[PDB]
Design a binder for this molecule. Structure first.
Ligand SMILES: *[C@H](c1ccsc1)c1oc(CO)cc(=O)c1O
Length: 148
């Protein structure tokens, strides 16, 4: 958290906090390149090429079985108007879950030039583990666009 929300090289501190009252979520979002250790402690961005000042902010949801009460556990209770409060740097970024669907690792047409939006918070919540190869089949994607 600092002036003009951006992502530093330190992958240990918090860039912003994710607050979704509808999902009982008020947890720290870790700014990272979706590297293993980043997800093991919390949620991370999809890449490090994105930014908090960028139009594309994509948070990879690290769903886990061991833990019953972590960040994206109850995010499945969210809906179109869950009021997503991203407390980043200083400001409270409110997003609305207007575009909700789920995709698969074999769907490379969703993570693309989906321009035309404002600051969109792409919640990539990977659910359903495929033990046969080690992937997550259901990539639930909640595109919460910065709401008025
Ligand atoms: C799903 C996943 C999340 C934690 S481990 C696997 C997943 O996540 C991303 C990053 O947003 C992209 C994918 O293609 C995934 O399979």
């Amino acid at each position: 958290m600092q002036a003009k929300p951006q992502i530093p090289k330190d992958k240990s501190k918090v860039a912003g906090y994710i607050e979704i009252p509808d999902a009982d979520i008020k947890e720290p979002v870790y700014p990272g390149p979706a590297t293993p250790e980043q997800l093991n402690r919390g949620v991370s961005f999809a890449e490090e090429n994105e930014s908090l000042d960028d139009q594309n902010i994509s948070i990879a949801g690290h769903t886990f079985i061991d833990r019953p009460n972590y960040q994206f556990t109850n995010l499945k209770a969210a809906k179109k108007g869950s009021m997503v409060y991203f407390k980043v740097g200083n400001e409270t970024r409110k997003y609305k879950m207007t575009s909700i669907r789920d995709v698969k690792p074999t769907d490379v047409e969703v993570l693309d030039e989906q321009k035309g939006k404002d600051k969109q918070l792409t919640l990539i919540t990977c659910d359903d583990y495929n033990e046969k190869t080690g992937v997550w089949e259901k990539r639930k994607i909640f595109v919460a666009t910065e709401v008025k």
